[PDB]
Write a protein that binds this ligand. Structure first.
Ligand SMILES: C[C@@H]1O[C@@H](O[C@@H]2[C@@H](O[C@H]3O[C@H](CO)[C@H](O)[C@H](O)[C@H]3O)[C@@H](O)[C@@H](CO)O[C@@H]2O)[C@@H](O)[C@H](O)[C@@H]1O
Ligand SMILES: C[C@@H]1O[C@@H](O[C@@H]2[C@@H](O[C@H]3O[C@H](CO)[C@H](O)[C@H](O)[C@H]3O)[C@@H](O)[C@@H](CO)O[C@@H]2O)[C@@H](O)[C@H](O)[C@@H]1O
Ligand SMILES: C[C@@H]1O[C@@H](O[C@@H]2[C@@H](O[C@H]3O[C@H](CO)[C@H](O)[C@H](O)[C@H]3O)[C@@H](O)[C@@H](CO)O[C@H]2O)[C@@H](O)[C@H](O)[C@@H]1O
Ligand SMILES: C[C@@H]1O[C@@H](O[C@@H]2[C@@H](O[C@H]3O[C@H](CO)[C@H](O)[C@H](O)[C@H]3O)[C@@H](O)[C@@H](CO)O[C@H]2O)[C@@H](O)[C@H](O)[C@@H]1O
Ligand SMILES: C[C@@H]1O[C@@H](O[C@@H]2[C@@H](O[C@H]3O[C@H](CO)[C@H](O)[C@H](O)[C@H]3O)[C@@H](O)[C@@H](CO)O[C@H]2O)[C@@H](O)[C@H](O)[C@@H]1O
Ligand SMILES: C[C@@H]1O[C@@H](O[C@@H]2[C@@H](O[C@H]3O[C@H](CO)[C@H](O)[C@H](O)[C@H]3O)[C@@H](O)[C@@H](CO)O[C@H]2O)[C@@H](O)[C@H](O)[C@@H]1O
Ligand SMILES: [Ca+2]
Ligand SMILES: [Ca+2]
Ligand SMILES: [Ca+2]
Ligand SMILES: [Ca+2]
Ligand SMILES: [Ca+2]
Ligand SMILES: [Ca+2]
Ligand SMILES: [Ca+2]
Ligand SMILES: [Ca+2]
Lengths: 292, 292
């Protein structure tokens, strides 16, 4: 089954993503096809999939920005029925907001079926225009129709995935202990991670013995990303990925505190120096503790 | 010997503290006797004692607020010589700024002798008035004269002392690991710890699943205290005490993240709930990790 997490949902036929129009929280805001920029946060185009207990392959889909849910208007099975953002909750019993999401016949893209109507999410006429209508539409699980096929591009990691990325890194100390703080994390492109740093007041901060040294920079960066996450998104049930690490050098005579993020492919960690905004594959320290 | 740390230096005869007048960083700012309020941060009256390597019982005394040093004017041995704040460094060879500090004949208070002049820090005429002159003055190590006797009231803890306070607490999990970040810490009265919290934006922050939950509040509070430390004091070589803890309940089925501070007597820790500003001797969790 599709895993719990945050997805950028991209049509299989044309490069249009599922977009809540203007990110609006109003009930009935149309959900439309819209172009996107890879390796950015696409602000109106991120969807938190929450599995429904006891209902196989079925999910609510919550817009990360608005906190409102993908909703089939009045649950109508009529072809052309509006698909809109609407107030709801993560584990609602409202079938208008419940979606069975399973692999299409190509085995890579998914089809998205309303649980009540049994109709499918359809980019009408495969229109690649910004603001193209998305509707519930008659269809089948096995047909090739690209109007109803959707790539679920995973934008989050589970804590287990983050832990695996750390574990395969070559700069981990033998004494390493990791402390996990949340369960599912939006992975930032470096462009956004950098922006948060740039706006944090840290670029302007002076290194000062004990009173504002390694530990203070690293903790301040983590706090900055935490604040950004809450200020930026209205959905709940996920965190923003930003780790803190304490490390020791090879000679075992010097220590450092710093941050880390994740690669685009989610497979590896990358170290971040909060004193200068630099990204490094080797920061010159082996991590003996991390929290994230 | 007197230990490295931060001291509130109180005359033995009258309740006047050593005060850098108006906290001014100007060279030549008079150091004077001034009244004080116990259980507050006395902003102009905190002194960081740095031991000089291989000069027994001898220290620089740096005002925490100004970053400037206690300085005997032109190193004169004349009775009545000005004692002022003056620019310097922690390990200076300038004898005007070097002070031999040893127990008086009462075995509890200290005398403070200029390393160059061999004269003593003297509250002139035992004057208890605010702004009373402090001067270098003839004297002896053994005499009873209270004008030249000073209680060194310790306002900081070493990391070892902090570690000991944690270790004697009854709410520590069997699996506990602690991660020490600095070496010497100003202990805040709860009044000041609370003030930092009140101004941090946390009192007005909503708990939100993963995106702004326990860990976010605890880390935000630590970052707030770190920012406050650097913004508040010009001296270097110390940090402000504020810990983060992760804990698990007795039933082992729920976890929490929170902060901790120290008691006035420095012997014990006290838990702090960043979601509501409360202080607790028992927060209902046993700590399995701490950083501070
Ligand atoms: C170009 C066109 O593609 C297919 O039709 C789609 C529609 O397909 C869906 O609805 C039809 C009934 O209208 C039928 O139930 C089909 O099984 C289902 O996938 C639909 O995607 C609309 C709106 O976007 O566009 C096209 O009309 C195909 O069935 C047609 O024969 C034709 O090849
Ligand atoms: C009341 C007074 O107390 C003592 O005198 C102090 C001064 O004491 C210091 O300086 C004197 C010389 O002036 C001498 O060297 C002494 O050993 C030394 O402690 C000094 O503290 C001043 C300034 O505050 O005040 C008093 O004059 C004592 O020696 C006097 O006989 C007399 O009892
Ligand atoms: C928040 C807002 O985001 C951008 O505008 C969105 C727009 O974003 C997508 O489309 C644009 C071009 O229109 C780019 O491809 C972006 O990479 C996409 O993410 C859509 O979401 C529409 C419809 O909901 O709303 C706009 O606000 C950006 O252009 C703005 O400057 C701004 O940052
Ligand atoms: C059949 C109908 O179901 C519910 O109403 C839906 C509505 O549901 C959501 O929004 C309303 C406010 O409009 C409430 O907050 C619900 O809790 C939400 O789940 C939407 O799905 C719209 C648009 O498709 O359709 C309505 O039917 C329920 O509130 C009604 O009482 C009634 O049972
Ligand atoms: C920063 C400033 O601190 C206080 O004023 C200081 C003053 O502080 C001490 O004396 C006052 C009475 O004048 C109280 O006893 C305090 O508890 C002491 O710490 C002195 O340091 C003088 C001389 O340098 O400077 C003043 O600025 C306080 O009264 C102010 O409101 C303010 O917070
Ligand atoms: C003997 C004298 O010693 C030094 O001057 C001191 C002076 O020293 C501090 O302040 C000056 C600037 O005035 C420099 O930053 C020094 O590095 C500091 O240590 C003060 O102690 C004053 C007041 O007592 O006395 C002067 O004698 C040195 O700078 C001189 O060149 C000269 O060697
Ligand atoms: Ca395409
Ligand atoms: Ca958490
Ligand atoms: Ca800052
Ligand atoms: Ca520090
Ligand atoms: Ca007294
Ligand atoms: Ca440090
Ligand atoms: Ca805040
Ligand atoms: Ca969190």
């Amino acid at each position: 089954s599709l895993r719990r997490g945050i997805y950028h949902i991209e049509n299989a036929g044309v490069p249009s993503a599922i977009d809540l129009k203007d990110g609006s929280s109003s009930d009935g805001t149309p959900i439309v096809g819209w172009q996107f920029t890879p390796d950015t946060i696409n602000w109106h185009q991120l969807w938190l999939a929450e599995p429904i207990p006891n209902v196989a392959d079925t999910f609510t889909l919550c817009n990360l920005f608005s906190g409102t849910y993908m909703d089939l208007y009045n649950g109508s099975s009529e072809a052309g029925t509006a698909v809109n953002g609407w107030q709801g909750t993560a584990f609602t019993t409202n079938p208008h907001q419940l979606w069975t999401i399973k692999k299409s016949s190509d085995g890579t893209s998914y089809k998205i079926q309303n649980y009540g109507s049994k109709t499918f999410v359809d980019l009408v006429n495969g229109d690649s225009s910004d603001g193209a209508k998305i509707a519930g539409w008659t269809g089948t699980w096995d047909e090739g129709n690209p109007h109803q096929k959707w790539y679920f591009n995973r934008m989050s990691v589970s804590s287990a995935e983050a832990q695996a990325a750390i574990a395969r890194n070559p700069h981990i100390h033998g004494t390493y202990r990791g402390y996990i703080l949340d369960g599912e994390y939006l992975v930032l492109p470096n462009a956004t991670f950098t922006q948060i740093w740039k706006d944090s007041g840290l670029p302007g901060s002076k290194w000062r013995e004990q009173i504002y040294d390694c530990d203070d920079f690293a903790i301040a960066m983590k706090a900055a990303v935490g604040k950004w996450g809450a200020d930026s998104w209205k959905a709940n049930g996920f965190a923003i990925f930003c780790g803190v690490m304490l490390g020791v050098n090879k000679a075992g005579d010097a220590a450092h505190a710093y941050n880390f993020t994740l690669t685009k492919d989610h497979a590896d960690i990358v170290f971040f120096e909060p004193q200068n905004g630099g990204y490094l594959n080797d920061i010159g320290y082996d991590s003996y503790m991390a929290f994230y």
